[PDB]
JSON list of C-alpha atoms and ligand atoms in Angstrom, two decimals:
[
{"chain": "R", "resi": 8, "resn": "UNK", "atom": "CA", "xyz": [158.03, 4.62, 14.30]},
{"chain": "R", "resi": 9, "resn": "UNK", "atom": "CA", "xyz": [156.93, 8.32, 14.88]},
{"chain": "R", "resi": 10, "resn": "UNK", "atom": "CA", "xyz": [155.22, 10.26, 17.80]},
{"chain": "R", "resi": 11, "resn": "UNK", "atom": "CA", "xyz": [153.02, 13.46, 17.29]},
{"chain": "R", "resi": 12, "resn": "UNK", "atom": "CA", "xyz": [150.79, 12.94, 19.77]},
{"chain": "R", "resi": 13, "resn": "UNK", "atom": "CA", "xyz": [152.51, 11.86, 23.27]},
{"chain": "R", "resi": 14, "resn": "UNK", "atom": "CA", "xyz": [150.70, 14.33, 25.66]},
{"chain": "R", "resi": 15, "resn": "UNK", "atom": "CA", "xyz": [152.44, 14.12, 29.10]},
{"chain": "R", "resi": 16, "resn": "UNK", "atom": "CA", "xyz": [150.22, 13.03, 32.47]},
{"chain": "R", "resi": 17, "resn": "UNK", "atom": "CA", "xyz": [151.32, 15.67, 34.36]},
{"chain": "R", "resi": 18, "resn": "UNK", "atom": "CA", "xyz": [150.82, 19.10, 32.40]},
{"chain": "R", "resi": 19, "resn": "UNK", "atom": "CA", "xyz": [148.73, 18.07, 29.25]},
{"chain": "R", "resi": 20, "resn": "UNK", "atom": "CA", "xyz": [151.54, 19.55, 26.33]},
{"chain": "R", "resi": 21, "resn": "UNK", "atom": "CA", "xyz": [151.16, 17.46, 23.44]},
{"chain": "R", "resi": 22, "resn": "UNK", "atom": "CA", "xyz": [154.44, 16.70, 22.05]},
{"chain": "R", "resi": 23, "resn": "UNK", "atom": "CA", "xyz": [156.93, 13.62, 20.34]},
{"chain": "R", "resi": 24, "resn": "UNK", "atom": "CA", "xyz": [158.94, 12.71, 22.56]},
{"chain": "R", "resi": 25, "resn": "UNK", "atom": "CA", "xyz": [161.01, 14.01, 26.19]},
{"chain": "R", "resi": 26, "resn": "UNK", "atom": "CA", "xyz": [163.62, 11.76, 28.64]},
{"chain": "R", "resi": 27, "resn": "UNK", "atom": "CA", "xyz": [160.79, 9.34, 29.36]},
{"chain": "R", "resi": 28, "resn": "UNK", "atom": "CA", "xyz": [159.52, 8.68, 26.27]},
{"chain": "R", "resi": 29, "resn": "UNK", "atom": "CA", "xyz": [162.80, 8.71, 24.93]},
{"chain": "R", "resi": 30, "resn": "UNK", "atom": "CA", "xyz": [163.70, 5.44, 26.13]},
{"chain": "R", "resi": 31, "resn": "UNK", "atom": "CA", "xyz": [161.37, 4.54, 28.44]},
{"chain": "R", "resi": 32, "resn": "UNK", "atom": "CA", "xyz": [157.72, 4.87, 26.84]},
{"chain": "R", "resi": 33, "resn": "UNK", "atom": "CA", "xyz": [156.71, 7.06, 29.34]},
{"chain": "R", "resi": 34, "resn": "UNK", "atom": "CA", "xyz": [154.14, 9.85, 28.45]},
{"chain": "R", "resi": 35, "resn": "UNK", "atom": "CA", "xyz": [155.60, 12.50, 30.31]},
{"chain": "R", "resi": 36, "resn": "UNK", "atom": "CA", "xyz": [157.72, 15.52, 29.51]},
{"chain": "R", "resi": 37, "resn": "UNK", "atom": "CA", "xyz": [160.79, 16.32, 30.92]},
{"chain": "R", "resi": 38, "resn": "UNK", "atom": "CA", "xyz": [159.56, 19.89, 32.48]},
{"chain": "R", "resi": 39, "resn": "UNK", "atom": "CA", "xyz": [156.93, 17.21, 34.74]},
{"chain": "R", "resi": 40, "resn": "UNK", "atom": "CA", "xyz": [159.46, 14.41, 35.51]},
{"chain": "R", "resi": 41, "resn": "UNK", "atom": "CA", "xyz": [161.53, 15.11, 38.64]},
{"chain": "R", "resi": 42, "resn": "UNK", "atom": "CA", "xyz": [164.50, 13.31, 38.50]},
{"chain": "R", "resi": 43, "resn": "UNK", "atom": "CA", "xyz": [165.73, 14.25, 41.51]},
{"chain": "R", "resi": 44, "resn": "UNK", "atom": "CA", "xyz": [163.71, 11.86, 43.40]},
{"chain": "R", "resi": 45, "resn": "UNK", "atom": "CA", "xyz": [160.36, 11.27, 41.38]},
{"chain": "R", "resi": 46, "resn": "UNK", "atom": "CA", "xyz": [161.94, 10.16, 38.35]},
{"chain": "R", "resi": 47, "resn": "UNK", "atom": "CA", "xyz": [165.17, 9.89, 40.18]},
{"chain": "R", "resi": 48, "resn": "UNK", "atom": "CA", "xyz": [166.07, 6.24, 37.94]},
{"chain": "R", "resi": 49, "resn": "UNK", "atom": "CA", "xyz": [167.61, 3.78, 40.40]},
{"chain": "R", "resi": 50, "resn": "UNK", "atom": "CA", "xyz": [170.43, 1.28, 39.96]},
{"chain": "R", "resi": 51, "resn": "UNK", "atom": "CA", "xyz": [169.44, -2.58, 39.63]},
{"chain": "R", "resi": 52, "resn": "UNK", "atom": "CA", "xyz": [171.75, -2.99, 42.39]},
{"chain": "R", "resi": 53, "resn": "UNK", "atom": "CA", "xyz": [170.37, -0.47, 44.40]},
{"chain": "R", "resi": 54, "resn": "UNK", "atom": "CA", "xyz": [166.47, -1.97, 43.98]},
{"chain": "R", "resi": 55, "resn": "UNK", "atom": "CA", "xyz": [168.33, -5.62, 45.09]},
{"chain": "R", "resi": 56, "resn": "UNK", "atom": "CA", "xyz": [169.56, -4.45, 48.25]},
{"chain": "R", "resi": 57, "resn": "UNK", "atom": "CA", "xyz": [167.40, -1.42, 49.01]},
{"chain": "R", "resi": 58, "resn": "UNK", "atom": "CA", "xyz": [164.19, -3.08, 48.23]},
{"chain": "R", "resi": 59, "resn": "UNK", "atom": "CA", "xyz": [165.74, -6.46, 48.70]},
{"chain": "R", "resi": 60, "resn": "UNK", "atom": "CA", "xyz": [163.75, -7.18, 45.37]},
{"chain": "R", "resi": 61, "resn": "UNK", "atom": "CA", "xyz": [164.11, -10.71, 43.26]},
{"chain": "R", "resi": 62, "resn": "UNK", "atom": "CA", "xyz": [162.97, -11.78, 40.36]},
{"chain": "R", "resi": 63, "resn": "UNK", "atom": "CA", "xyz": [159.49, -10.32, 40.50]},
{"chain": "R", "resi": 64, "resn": "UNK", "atom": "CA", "xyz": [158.97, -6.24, 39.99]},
{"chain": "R", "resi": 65, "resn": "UNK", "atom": "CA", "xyz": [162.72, -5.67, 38.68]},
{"chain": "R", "resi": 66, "resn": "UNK", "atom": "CA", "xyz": [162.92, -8.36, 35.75]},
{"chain": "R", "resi": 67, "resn": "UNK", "atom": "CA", "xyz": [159.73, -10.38, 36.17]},
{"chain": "R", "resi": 68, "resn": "UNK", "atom": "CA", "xyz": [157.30, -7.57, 36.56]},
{"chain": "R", "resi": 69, "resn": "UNK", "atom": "CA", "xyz": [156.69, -7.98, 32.92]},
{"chain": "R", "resi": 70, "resn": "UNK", "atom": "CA", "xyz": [157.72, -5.44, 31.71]},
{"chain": "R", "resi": 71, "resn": "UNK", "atom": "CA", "xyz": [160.13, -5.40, 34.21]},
{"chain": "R", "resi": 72, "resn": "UNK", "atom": "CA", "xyz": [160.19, -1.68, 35.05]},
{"chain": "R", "resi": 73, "resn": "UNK", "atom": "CA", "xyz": [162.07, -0.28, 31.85]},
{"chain": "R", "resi": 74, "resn": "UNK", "atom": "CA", "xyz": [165.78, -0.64, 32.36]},
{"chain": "R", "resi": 75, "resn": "UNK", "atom": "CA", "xyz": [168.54, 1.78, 31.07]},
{"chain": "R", "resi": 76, "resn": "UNK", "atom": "CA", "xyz": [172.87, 2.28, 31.31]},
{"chain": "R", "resi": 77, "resn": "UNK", "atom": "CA", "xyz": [175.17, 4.25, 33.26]},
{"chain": "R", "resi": 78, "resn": "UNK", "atom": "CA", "xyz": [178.41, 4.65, 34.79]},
{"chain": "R", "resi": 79, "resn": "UNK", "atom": "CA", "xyz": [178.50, 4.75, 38.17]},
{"chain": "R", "resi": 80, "resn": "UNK", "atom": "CA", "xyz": [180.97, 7.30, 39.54]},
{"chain": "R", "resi": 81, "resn": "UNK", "atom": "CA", "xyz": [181.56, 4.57, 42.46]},
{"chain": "R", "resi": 82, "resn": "UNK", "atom": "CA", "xyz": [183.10, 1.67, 43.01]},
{"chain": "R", "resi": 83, "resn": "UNK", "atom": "CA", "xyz": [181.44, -1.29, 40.47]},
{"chain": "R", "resi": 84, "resn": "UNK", "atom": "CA", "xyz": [181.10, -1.67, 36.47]},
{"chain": "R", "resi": 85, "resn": "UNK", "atom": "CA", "xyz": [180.23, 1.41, 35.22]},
{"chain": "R", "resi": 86, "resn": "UNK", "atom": "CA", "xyz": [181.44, 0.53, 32.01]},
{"chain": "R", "resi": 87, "resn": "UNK", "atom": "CA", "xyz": [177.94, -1.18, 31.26]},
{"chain": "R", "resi": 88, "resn": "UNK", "atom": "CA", "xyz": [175.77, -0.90, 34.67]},
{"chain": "R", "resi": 89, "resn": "UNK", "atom": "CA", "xyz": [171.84, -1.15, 34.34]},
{"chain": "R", "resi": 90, "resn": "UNK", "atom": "CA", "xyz": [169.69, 1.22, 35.55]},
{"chain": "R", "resi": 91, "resn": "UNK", "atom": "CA", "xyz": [165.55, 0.79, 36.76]},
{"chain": "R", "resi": 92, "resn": "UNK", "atom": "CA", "xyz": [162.74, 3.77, 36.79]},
{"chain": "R", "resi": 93, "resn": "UNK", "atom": "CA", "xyz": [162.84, 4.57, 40.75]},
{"chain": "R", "resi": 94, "resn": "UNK", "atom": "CA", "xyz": [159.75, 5.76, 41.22]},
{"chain": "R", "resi": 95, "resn": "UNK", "atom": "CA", "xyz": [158.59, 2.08, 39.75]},
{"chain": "R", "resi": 96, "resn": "UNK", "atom": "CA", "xyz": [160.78, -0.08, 41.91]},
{"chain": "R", "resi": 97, "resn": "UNK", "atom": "CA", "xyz": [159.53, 2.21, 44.70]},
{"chain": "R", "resi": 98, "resn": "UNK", "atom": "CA", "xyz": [155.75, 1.69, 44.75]},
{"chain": "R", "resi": 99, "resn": "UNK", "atom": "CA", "xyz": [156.43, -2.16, 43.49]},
{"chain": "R", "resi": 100, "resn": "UNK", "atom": "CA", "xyz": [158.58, -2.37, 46.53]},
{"chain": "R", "resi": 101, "resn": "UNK", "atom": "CA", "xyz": [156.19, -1.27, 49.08]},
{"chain": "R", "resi": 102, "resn": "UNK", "atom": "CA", "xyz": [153.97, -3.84, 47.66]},
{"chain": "R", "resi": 103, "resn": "UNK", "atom": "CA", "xyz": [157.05, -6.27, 47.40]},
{"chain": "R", "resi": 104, "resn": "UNK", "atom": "CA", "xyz": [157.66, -6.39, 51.46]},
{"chain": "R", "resi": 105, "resn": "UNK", "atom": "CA", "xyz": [154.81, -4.70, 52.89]},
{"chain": "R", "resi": 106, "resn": "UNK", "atom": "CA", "xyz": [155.89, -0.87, 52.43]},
{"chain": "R", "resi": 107, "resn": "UNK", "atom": "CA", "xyz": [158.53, 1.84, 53.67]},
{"chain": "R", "resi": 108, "resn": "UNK", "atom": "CA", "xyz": [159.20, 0.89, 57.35]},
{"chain": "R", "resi": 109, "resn": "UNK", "atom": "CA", "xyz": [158.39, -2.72, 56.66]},
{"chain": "R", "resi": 110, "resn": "UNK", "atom": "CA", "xyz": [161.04, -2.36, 53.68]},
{"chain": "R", "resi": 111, "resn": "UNK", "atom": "CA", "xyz": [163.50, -1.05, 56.61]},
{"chain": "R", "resi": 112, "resn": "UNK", "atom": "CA", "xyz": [162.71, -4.74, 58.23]},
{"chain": "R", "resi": 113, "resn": "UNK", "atom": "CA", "xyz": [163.52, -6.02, 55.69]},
{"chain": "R", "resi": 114, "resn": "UNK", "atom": "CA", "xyz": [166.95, -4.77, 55.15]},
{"chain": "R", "resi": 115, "resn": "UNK", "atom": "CA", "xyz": [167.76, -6.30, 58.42]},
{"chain": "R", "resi": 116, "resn": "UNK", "atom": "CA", "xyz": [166.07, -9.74, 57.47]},
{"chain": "R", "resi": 117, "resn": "UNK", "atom": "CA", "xyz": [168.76, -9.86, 55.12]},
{"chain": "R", "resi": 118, "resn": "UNK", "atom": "CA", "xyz": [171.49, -8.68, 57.22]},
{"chain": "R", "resi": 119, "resn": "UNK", "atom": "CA", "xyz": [170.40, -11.39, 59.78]},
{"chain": "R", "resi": 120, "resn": "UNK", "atom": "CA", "xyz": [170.91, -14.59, 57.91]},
{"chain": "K", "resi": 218, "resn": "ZN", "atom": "ZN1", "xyz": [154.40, 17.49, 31.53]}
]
């Protein structure tokens, strides 16, 4: 119901609440998160054929990497799109098809059938 006490894992500042822990439970500030990559979120989309991901660390991870909504400025619904915490769908992928290079592999496993 309340927070008073959400200290972020990057600098330590007790506080209620920042973009994280806003919507995503995260215990982290906004001055720590980097959402220019780091906390850079991700579209589902994006984690489906960049990480070639299934049902497993996007809506199976359980939680399934907290989810959010956008409009993308491109080409596809942005009038209700989903977003996915990046840097989550980033270390789940490595583990997902083996890592970074291997995830390149991938891509082309995909563009081969
Ligand atoms: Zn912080």
């Amino acid at each position: 119901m309340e927070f008073d006490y959400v200290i972020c894992e990057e600098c330590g500042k007790e506080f209620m609440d920042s973009y994280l822990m806003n919507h995503f439970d995260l215990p982290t500030c906004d001055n720590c998160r980097d959402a220019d990559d780091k906390h850079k979120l991700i579209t589902k989309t994006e984690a489906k054929q960049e990480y070639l991901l299934k049902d497993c660390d996007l809506e199976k991870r359980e939680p399934p990497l907290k989810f959010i909504v956008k409009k993308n400025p491109h080409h596809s619904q942005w009038g209700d799109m989903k977003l996915y915490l990046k840097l989550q769908i980033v270390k789940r992928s490595l583990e997902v098809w083996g890592s970074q290079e291997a995830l390149e592999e991938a891509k082309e496993v995909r563009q081969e059938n």
